[PDB]
Amino acid sequence: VFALGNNLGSTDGYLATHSQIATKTSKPLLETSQTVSVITREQIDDTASKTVQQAMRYTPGIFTGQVGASNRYDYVVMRGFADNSVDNIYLDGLKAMGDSGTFSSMQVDPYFLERIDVLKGPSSVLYGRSLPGGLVALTSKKPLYEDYRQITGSIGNMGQKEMGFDFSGPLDEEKRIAYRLIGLGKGSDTQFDHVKEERYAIAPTLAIDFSDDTTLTLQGYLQHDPNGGYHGGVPADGTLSHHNGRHISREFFDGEPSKDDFDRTQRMFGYQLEHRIDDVWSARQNFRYLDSDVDLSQVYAYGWSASEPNKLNRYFSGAREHLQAYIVDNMLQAEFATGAARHTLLTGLDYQRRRTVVDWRSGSASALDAFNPVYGDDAISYFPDDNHTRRLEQTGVYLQDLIDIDQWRFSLGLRQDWVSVTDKNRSTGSKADDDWEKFTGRIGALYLFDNGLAPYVSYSESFNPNAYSDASGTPLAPTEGKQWELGLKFQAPGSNSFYTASLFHITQENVASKEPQDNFYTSVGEVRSQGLELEAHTQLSDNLKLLGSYTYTDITYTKSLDGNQGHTPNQAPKHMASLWADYAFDAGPLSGLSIGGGARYVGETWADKENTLRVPDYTLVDARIGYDLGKLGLKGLDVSLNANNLLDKDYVASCYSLDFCYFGEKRNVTATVNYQF
Numbered sequence: 290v291f292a293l294g295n296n297l298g299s300t301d302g303y304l305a306t307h308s309q310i311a312t313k314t315s316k317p318l319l320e321t322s323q324t325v326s327v328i329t330r331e332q333i334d335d336t337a338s339k340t341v342q343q344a345m346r347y348t349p350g351i352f353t354g355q356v357g358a359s360n361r362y363d364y365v366v367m368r369g370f371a372d373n374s375v376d377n378i379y380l381d382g383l384k385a386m387g388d389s390g391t392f393s394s395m396q397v398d399p400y401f402l403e404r405i406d407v408l409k410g411p412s413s414v415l416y417g418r419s420l421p422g423g424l425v426a427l428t429s430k431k432p433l434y435e436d437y438r439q440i441t442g443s444i445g446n447m448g449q450k451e452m453g454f455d456f457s458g459p460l461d462e463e464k465r466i467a468y469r470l471i472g473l474g475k476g477s478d479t480q481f482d483h484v485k486e487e488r489y490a491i492a493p494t495l496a497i498d499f500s501d502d503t504t505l506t507l508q509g510y511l512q513h514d515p516n517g518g519y520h521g522g523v524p525a526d527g528t529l530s531h532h533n534g535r536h537i538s539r540e541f542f543d544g545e546p547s548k549d550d551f552d553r554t555q556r557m558f559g560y561q562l563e564h565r566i567d568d569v570w571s572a573r574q575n576f577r578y579l580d581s582d583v584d585l586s587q588v589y590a591y592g593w594s595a596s597e598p599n600k601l602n603r604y605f606s607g608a609r610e611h612l613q614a615y616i617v618d619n620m621l622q623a624e625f626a627t628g629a630a631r632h633t634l635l636t637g638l639d640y641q642r643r644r645t646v647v648d649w650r651s652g653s654a655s656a657l658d659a660f661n662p663v664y665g666d667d668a669i670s671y672f673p674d675d676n677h678t679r680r681l682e683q684t685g686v687y688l689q690d691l692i693d694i695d696q697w698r699f700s701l702g703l704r705q706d707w708v709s710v711t712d713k714n715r716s717t718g719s720k721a722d723d724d725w726e727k728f729t730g731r732i733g734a735l736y737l738f739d740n741g742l743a744p745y746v747s748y749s750e751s752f753n754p755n756a757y758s759d760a761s762g763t764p765l766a767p768t769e770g771k772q773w774e775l776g777l778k779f780q781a782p783g784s785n786s787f788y789t790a791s792l793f794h795i796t797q798e799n800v801a802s803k804e805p806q807d808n809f810y811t812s813v814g815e816v817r818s819q820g821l822e823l824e825a826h827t828q829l830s831d832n833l834k835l836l837g838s839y840t841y842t843d844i845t846y847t848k849s850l851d852g853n854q855g856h857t858p859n860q861a862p863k864h865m866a867s868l869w870a871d872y873a874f875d876a877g878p879l880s881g882l883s884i885g886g887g888a889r890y891v892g893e894t895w896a897d898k899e900n901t902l903r904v905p906d907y908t909l910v911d912a913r914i915g916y917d918l919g920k921l922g923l924k925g926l927d928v929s930l931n932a933n934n935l936l937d938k939d940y941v942a943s944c945y946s947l948d949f950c951y952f953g954e955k956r957n958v959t960a961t962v963n964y965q966f
């Protein structure tokens with residue numbers, strides 16, 4: 290029922306059957322001509338992820354470690370495209386609406402979600418401004434039409450506090466009206482010294498059934514991060530090498546406790562409206578408005594001091610940003626048939642308007658003795674202020690037809706966009722003002738075999754506004770992703786196991802490169818990613834579940850005046866592989882017990898785009914044990930005990946630069962308890 294803007298599959302533990310992220314209507318994973326991965330609530334829960342970015346540790350084509358063990362932002366690197374990777378999250382069908390050009394990027398706390406879909410490659414024909422990596426859609430919890438009431442509390446190493454509830458049920462006699470109220474306060478320290486994480490989040494949801502054929506859902510999300518944990522980055526020289534014989538803490542705080550602040554207040558409001566006209570015509574409208582306050586004040590290590598032996602330079606950055614943004618998507622779907630062809634035709638109009646105000650401050654601070662340092666001097670030789678107002682408008686009209694004929698399943702997509710990005714410098718009084726029309730197209734064919742085997746070709750296209758200056762101080766013409774993808778999807782009919790293989794080849798044009806001392810960017814640049822993703826979910830018995838993934842990424846600068854042509858980028862492991870298992874007990878003394886575990890393997894990261902040194906291929910173990918002490922005879926009460934990186938390793942995640950390497954997260958430990966009623 291409905292299926293326009295709805296997934297409507299069946300999840301069985303770690304595997305789902307349908308997804309619309311590649312479709313904007315429920316189409317089963319096995320018939321869709323794109324690379325989709327679903328991360329279930331159970332996957333997130335069992336695997337003890339604290340972050341959207343953490344959830345996808347076990348997913349092929351995804352690099353989790355762009356900024357290492359810092360839970361401030363969600364850096365998801367899809368197929369080795371890391372430039373812009375914060376701008377990749379879609380919430381309940383609509384863009385997150387952050388500013389990857391300021392500090393105002395959002396975090397959706399997994400507790401509020403129940404499902405993560407992930408699409409790969411150029412995904413713009415339905416979504417618009419997007420990356421050639423792909424994108425990630427968070428389907429949050431919706432109202433349940435019968436009482437579900439649960440409370441949690443997790444304690445962990447690193448002084449981790451979590452406590453949350455999730456209440457839902459019908460308010461109505463006729464049960465046409467249902468609600469949901471999620472909420473969670475959440476503390477933590479981090480491995481890092483003098484950093485504290487906080488979050489306080491609530492989420493009311495009200496779902497109404499007016500007719501049999503019409504349903505309006507009302508959405509609200511308030512989230513307060515009074516502290517942002519850690520976000521610094523320390524040099525290659527004392528991490529990858531020894532720096533004069535010693536080489537930095539796994540807890541090293543490059544900042545200043547005196548002057549350490551991160552304050553993000555996320556206030557969202559929206560609705561999803563669904564109306565069925567005919568058994569042919571259904572139309573949906575999704576809207577969201579966002580309002581976010583970000584206050585930063587960080588002092589950070591930028592490379593070694595010439596004049597002091599074992600101390601780093603420290604520079605200040607400070608922000609007060611208020612962002613306003615609203616996005617709407619209006620769709621119109623005809624399910625109809627014409628001779629043997631089942632036409633599933635969508636036309637769509639989406640509009641998003643964003644406006645950021647930014648007050649940026651910066652300067653010099655004291656240097657810091659990198660091994661066993663002393664804190665206390667916190668004056669700043671400020672630089673000039675830099676205050677902007679950034680606007681962005683985006684109007685999108687798109688049209689899509691899924692043709693079912695015999696065993697063939699065809700996807701056609703066409704989209705027009707009209708973008709307008711503005712950057713008024715309030716300090717200078719100078720405003721850059723650029724407008725763009727670009728046209729994207731997708732085309733995807735797949736034969737479904739009666740045995741449940743399905744090859745598919747697919748060609749798709751991406752676009753996104755450049756983040757650079759036209760050596761005239763103007764936004765450059767936007768970057769363009771093109772993809773050939775070939776793949777093989779398979780599921781025997783009486784199995785609960787699913788197999789994906791993807792061959793991809795993605796070129797991305799007009800990416801900002803220049804002559805090195807010369808500092809005036811030109812847009813003739815090109816990046817080329819190709820490879821093969823292998824993803825496997827398998828049931829053996831009712832208690833056994835498995836995940837296995839393999840990823841080969843050949844990413845190159847096909848053009849760069851940087852001097853880096855033929856240079857493969859940093860933060861892009863050529864190979865990657867992961868595995869996860871979970872065993873429960875049917876009957877006997879161990880019934881209600883679930884032991885689980887797996888491992889992740891990352892390949893070699895380059896520290897720099899000139900490719901001067903690689904980063905140790907690191908390889909981590911995650912484990913857990915859970916007793917549903919409901920088998921004792923306390924029904925609805927259950928405990929989990931999880932631990933990540935069981936070998937408590939001190940590795941670096943990756944490096945942006947040689948001056949900037951990010952530490953891998955240490956052994957995280959959970960113990961958590963749940964009652965339901």
Ligand SMILES: O=C1CCC(=O)N(O)C/C=C\CCNC(=O)CCC(=O)N(O)CCCCCNC(=O)CCC(=O)N(O)CCCCCN1
Pocket residue numbers: 356362374375389390391392393394520521522587589606649945949
């Ligand atoms: O090294 C890192 C990770 C990467 C990083 O923070 N960057 O500077 C930029 C690299 C990644 C781009 C992904 N975008 C974001 O994470 C959005 C927020 C962010 O951290 N940004 O860099 C974007 C802010 C735009 C302003 C440009 N930079 C600054 O004002 C100070 C440096 C700046 O951008 N900072 O946040 C402070 C620099 C301190 C380094 C601590 N963190």
Ligand SMILES: [Fe+3]
Pocket residue numbers: none
């Ligand atoms: Fe930054």
